[PDB]
Amino acid sequence: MLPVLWLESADTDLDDITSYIARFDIDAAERLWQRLRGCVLPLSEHPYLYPPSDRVPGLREIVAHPNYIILYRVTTSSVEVVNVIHARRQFPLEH
Amino acid sequence: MLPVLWLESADTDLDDITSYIARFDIDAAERLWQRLRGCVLPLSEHPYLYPPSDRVPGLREIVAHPNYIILYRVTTSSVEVVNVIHARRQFPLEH
Amino acid sequence: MLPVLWLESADTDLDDITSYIARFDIDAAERLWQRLRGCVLPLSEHPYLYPPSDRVPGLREIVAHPNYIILYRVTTSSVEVVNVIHARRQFPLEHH
Amino acid sequence: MLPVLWLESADTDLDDITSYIARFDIDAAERLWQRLRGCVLPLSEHPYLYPPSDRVPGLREIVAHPNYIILYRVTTSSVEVVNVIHARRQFPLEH
Amino acid sequence: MLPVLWLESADTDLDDITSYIARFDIDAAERLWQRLRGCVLPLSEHPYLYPPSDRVPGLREIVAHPNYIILYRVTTSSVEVVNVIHARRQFPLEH
Amino acid sequence: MLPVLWLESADTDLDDITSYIARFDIDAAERLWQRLRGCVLPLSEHPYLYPPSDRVPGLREIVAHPNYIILYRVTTSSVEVVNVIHARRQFPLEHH
Amino acid sequence: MLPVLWLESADTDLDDITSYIARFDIDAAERLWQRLRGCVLPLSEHPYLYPPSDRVPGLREIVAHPNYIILYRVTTSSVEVVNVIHARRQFPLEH
Amino acid sequence: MLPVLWLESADTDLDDITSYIARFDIDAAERLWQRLRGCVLPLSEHPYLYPPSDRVPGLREIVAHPNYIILYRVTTSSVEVVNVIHARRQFPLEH
Amino acid sequence: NRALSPMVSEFETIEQENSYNEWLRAKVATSLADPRPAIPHDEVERRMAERFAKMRKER
Amino acid sequence: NRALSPMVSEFETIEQENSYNEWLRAKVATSLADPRPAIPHDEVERRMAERFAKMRKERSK
Amino acid sequence: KNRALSPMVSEFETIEQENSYNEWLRAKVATSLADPRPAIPHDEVERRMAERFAKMRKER
Amino acid sequence: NRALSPMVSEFETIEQENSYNEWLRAKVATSLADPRPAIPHDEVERRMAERFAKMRKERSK
Amino acid sequence: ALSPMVSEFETIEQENSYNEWLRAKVATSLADPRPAIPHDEVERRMAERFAKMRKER
Amino acid sequence: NRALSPMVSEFETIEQENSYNEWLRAKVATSLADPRPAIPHDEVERRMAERFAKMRKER
Amino acid sequence: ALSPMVSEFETIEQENSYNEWLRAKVATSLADPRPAIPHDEVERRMAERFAKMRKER
Amino acid sequence: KNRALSPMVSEFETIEQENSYNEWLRAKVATSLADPRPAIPHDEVERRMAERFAKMRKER
């Protein structure tokens, strides 16, 4: 059993993605976070559940939605959300 | 604990989807089945793991890949792969 | 690991309760089902998690909300939702 | 695995509820504590088990009984019981 | 994770202990069961927790109280309470 | 996850109990320590596992053997073995 | 959390090793089983603890003693002891 | 949770052991340190995992490899690597 | 008889508390004795989405 | 403000619901800002047994 | 009415596509469920797969 | 047979210890050979509440 | 060039440019000193985020 | 007073049961109030192996 | 040939013969149809094993 | 007395080796514990390692 933790950088991504979706539908930005949530939390008891990332080694890919991927790493003491990205386009970006 | 079963129609979708990917890259059609596998089998011990389908009620959606979705139903006695579809386009074909 | 099953009578409750709740707030009816759901399913891996029912022995109580209780029984081979009830009033009182 | 800790303010809540109850039934005071306690401890191995609080964000709600709610926060090093409240009335008071 | 099951013979033991105790203290009968029960259930997530029985091989001993032992066997599909015995005297009898 | 620590007074018990047990069975003294050990250490990952002590509140009882009890307290930062005692008789009754 | 299971073949090894040691010291054969035990059971909560086997891929090596290795595989539903071998010599053998 | 610390003398053993293995195979002396690593660090969250040393009391033995043993002590405030030795021969050297 | 303090009970009267309990006992006993076989969670899930969809259409 | 049906909410009117939810928010915020460090479960358990014991003594007098 | 969706808000280009996609999916699943041919277990699909790729690799 | 010290064993003499351990062995073996299938925890829990309830009724009469 | 059935991208260079960006992004995110915050704090930061948006109406 | 049935208690007399309890309460309270800092498990483990070794030597 | 510090074997061919044997052994053990028995049954088979040996004295 | 052990019952050839090995180990640990030089954390040993192999690889 591992506690679920997010990197400060994966949360900065969450705003950048939700804020962008709020411009058209504020509920779509909300619904996304609920599908994001429903992937991140299940990992506490089943961490080694999602396959390893091909593009980024040592990380695991969650295709939460056709256009969105959650990237996590299973540490010695926790499950760590590294970044959340758009599966098709280069978004969000570094600032 | 539930046994993993596929509907005959979900396997005819695997045939129509992999017999098409092989034409461009025969390994890509192989790699897909391996991501389609390590997402269908894990359901035997965790069947209520993937969220319910919005578009189709009573079914559950697995976004296995940005372009591909697995649709399954958790029965009284088994986990049933209903269909495998293209997340973006209307494919595979009718017969 | 146990499969989560509902009794026909427990769904018959869900019906009556959402059809009633909806006539004021169609989203409240929705939200309720999502809080019931988020209780019922977690039982598949942790069934002995909610305490036993006092009023009904051999059953377990989920106070999902101050006004709503889920009653389940952990069988030899499954987790079974027996009934969903209003925690304070006699409702839904099956009319047939 | 996280150790279960209570805030001084949640205990000085437990005292309050138990003292009022005892005024009628001293055993009901006792029975409540078995149940309140039998809610708080299971969290050590399953911390993300109870849903997040709507009214108070960053906290999680345990409807321990129709009239009583336990509010906890999971952290970096421990599961923390923040307050215990009557689910329907404004009681016990803060001090 | 394994479901906790009791053998009919261990229950027809619980009855026996509770009936004898009640002859003096009916609450001691009750208090025992909370503790006997509060030994048996923790096994669902931690089955290999209590050491193996010396006197009876393939079984595990729970010294629930100085005068009482719970005997369980873990298996393929469930944690099984085999018998409940008085740790010091030959009681309750088999039937 | 909590580190397992023993109070000087709980070891002082272990001493008296093995030195006593040994004068009959040097292996029984050994075997006892291995059953105490196999209780004490598992607490590091599961501290809230043994029920609270009735006679001493805020402490937890491990009936390691019908004649022997381990008493521990789960602190803010550790699992602490307070004393090891004979479950039926007043022993080891610290002589100083 | 995974249940600890042994393959029939890893238990046939256990006799072949203990029986061979009993010819010189029957207690040494016993002590070995206790060091074997103390490696196999800890795996139920920490399966991915011992490194993967180099010689045999998909298996994990436990150097329980300078002359003895435990080989296990972490399945979908259990931790499986595959074989127990002498770390330096080809022993025990196939029959 | 305990921090992983090495005694200066245990690191001088690493120096004498790896500066000798490099003479035959420089990669073997590297591979050894990687098996010496993924056995020393896991102790931070599981320090009471390896059995106590028989020959040296108050210490714990890690048979990292058939020819090599890690000796550690779990202090009040840390996990301490005392020495790394050859499981078969009297090596490394005194100074 | 005797009505109860809201801290003590989720009911107003003892008389009531019981009337509720007996009702729940009778309800569970009816629901368990019921022959109609148990439907899995995903079918209830289906019956739900169907239910709200039918209501939203009555606009 | 309007009235609420018991199926809809645990409160009698919205006015109450708002009053309650602001109270709870203020309570938690008071409880978190509080300096007194968090006590482990077994100490609360101790403070409990002591509490009921003191009451039971007061009933048989 | 017909709108042009962002590939950041939907997996569809327009709303017309989403409707005709979601009716197709509904019809597909409903066809697949009404289908009488009994469901085959995972290991048989696994078998049918290895056979499928093997037959393709043979085609030079 | 010889006498045992309470620190050494939970029994008064070895004779008892042997008698007890053969009884326990026979008891478990009877309990395992028994055909009646194992009932889940919540059913035992049910059979319990019923048991104590029947006794409490017998005390207030 | 790539067929949409084959890949989520458009060309072979897209499977180069995106994946190098992602590799650089993760490597930036891991090298970052700011310690990882637990799920319930992200949950808190979220409710606050949507609440601030709903107010802009 | 009143002696107890062995099924009911691990003691023979109520008088005794209590005398034991008060002793345990006083023992724990002495042991907790004790200033000497707590030794970790591995040191107790060390003190043990040392203890038996010293006894085996007295052959 | 190998130095004992370098390897647990004796020669380079020993690191071939032993590892092929182990590979063949595991592959035999996995292909075996007899279902895996739980830890407590092995535990039972053990107590029985040592008991049978102690009796031969 | 001096005996010839099986490599299946002990990690030593003879019993004389075991005694002189176990006294050496006892003396080694006792030297290592009595040592005043403060204990360095894992990441510093990790650093001292990468530096060690790097210096060796440089020696052609």
PDB file of C-alpha atoms in Angstrom, chain B residues 29-74:
ATOM      1  CA  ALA B  29      -0.381  -4.206 -34.916  1.00  0.00           C
ATOM      2  CA  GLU B  30       1.539  -6.571 -32.521  1.00  0.00           C
ATOM      3  CA  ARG B  31       2.448  -3.817 -29.940  1.00  0.00           C
ATOM      4  CA  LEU B  32      -1.249  -2.715 -29.923  1.00  0.00           C
ATOM      5  CA  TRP B  33      -2.441  -6.258 -28.992  1.00  0.00           C
ATOM      6  CA  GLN B  34       0.139  -6.283 -26.142  1.00  0.00           C
ATOM      7  CA  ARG B  35      -1.325  -2.954 -24.759  1.00  0.00           C
ATOM      8  CA  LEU B  36      -4.866  -4.431 -25.491  1.00  0.00           C
ATOM      9  CA  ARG B  37      -3.803  -7.542 -23.428  1.00  0.00           C
ATOM     10  CA  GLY B  38      -2.177  -5.862 -20.390  1.00  0.00           C
ATOM     11  CA  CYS B  39      -5.486  -3.954 -19.902  1.00  0.00           C
ATOM     12  CA  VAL B  40      -8.062  -6.796 -20.594  1.00  0.00           C
ATOM     13  CA  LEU B  41      -6.464  -9.482 -18.335  1.00  0.00           C
ATOM     14  CA  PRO B  42      -5.843  -7.198 -15.255  1.00  0.00           C
ATOM     15  CA  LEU B  43      -9.657  -6.945 -15.035  1.00  0.00           C
ATOM     16  CA  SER B  44     -10.011 -10.539 -13.656  1.00  0.00           C
ATOM     17  CA  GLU B  45      -9.034  -9.345 -10.121  1.00  0.00           C
ATOM     18  CA  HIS B  46      -9.992  -5.633 -10.581  1.00  0.00           C
ATOM     19  CA  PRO B  47     -13.121  -5.457 -12.832  1.00  0.00           C
ATOM     20  CA  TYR B  48     -14.704  -2.322 -11.399  1.00  0.00           C
ATOM     21  CA  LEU B  49     -11.391  -0.466 -12.085  1.00  0.00           C
ATOM     22  CA  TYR B  50     -12.242   1.379 -15.358  1.00  0.00           C
ATOM     23  CA  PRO B  51     -15.011   4.067 -15.285  1.00  0.00           C
ATOM     24  CA  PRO B  52     -18.486   3.449 -16.825  1.00  0.00           C
ATOM     25  CA  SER B  53     -19.110   4.417 -20.471  1.00  0.00           C
ATOM     26  CA  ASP B  54     -20.990   7.645 -20.971  1.00  0.00           C
ATOM     27  CA  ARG B  55     -22.094   7.048 -24.594  1.00  0.00           C
ATOM     28  CA  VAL B  56     -23.044   3.371 -23.884  1.00  0.00           C
ATOM     29  CA  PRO B  57     -24.626   2.732 -20.434  1.00  0.00           C
ATOM     30  CA  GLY B  58     -23.902  -0.486 -18.543  1.00  0.00           C
ATOM     31  CA  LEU B  59     -20.486  -0.737 -20.217  1.00  0.00           C
ATOM     32  CA  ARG B  60     -16.983   0.373 -19.097  1.00  0.00           C
ATOM     33  CA  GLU B  61     -14.393   2.277 -21.173  1.00  0.00           C
ATOM     34  CA  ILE B  62     -10.676   1.493 -21.343  1.00  0.00           C
ATOM     35  CA  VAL B  63      -8.739   4.135 -23.259  1.00  0.00           C
ATOM     36  CA  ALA B  64      -5.950   1.638 -24.010  1.00  0.00           C
ATOM     37  CA  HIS B  65      -4.331   4.087 -26.481  1.00  0.00           C
ATOM     38  CA  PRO B  66      -5.239   7.660 -27.707  1.00  0.00           C
ATOM     39  CA  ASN B  67      -6.801   6.072 -30.815  1.00  0.00           C
ATOM     40  CA  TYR B  68      -8.256   2.907 -29.232  1.00  0.00           C
ATOM     41  CA  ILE B  69     -10.987   2.017 -26.682  1.00  0.00           C
ATOM     42  CA  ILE B  70     -11.862  -1.375 -25.093  1.00  0.00           C
ATOM     43  CA  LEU B  71     -15.518  -1.749 -24.041  1.00  0.00           C
ATOM     44  CA  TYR B  72     -16.318  -4.302 -21.366  1.00  0.00           C
ATOM     45  CA  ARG B  73     -19.231  -5.313 -19.129  1.00  0.00           C
ATOM     46  CA  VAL B  74     -18.865  -6.880 -15.658  1.00  0.00           C
TER      47      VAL B  74
END
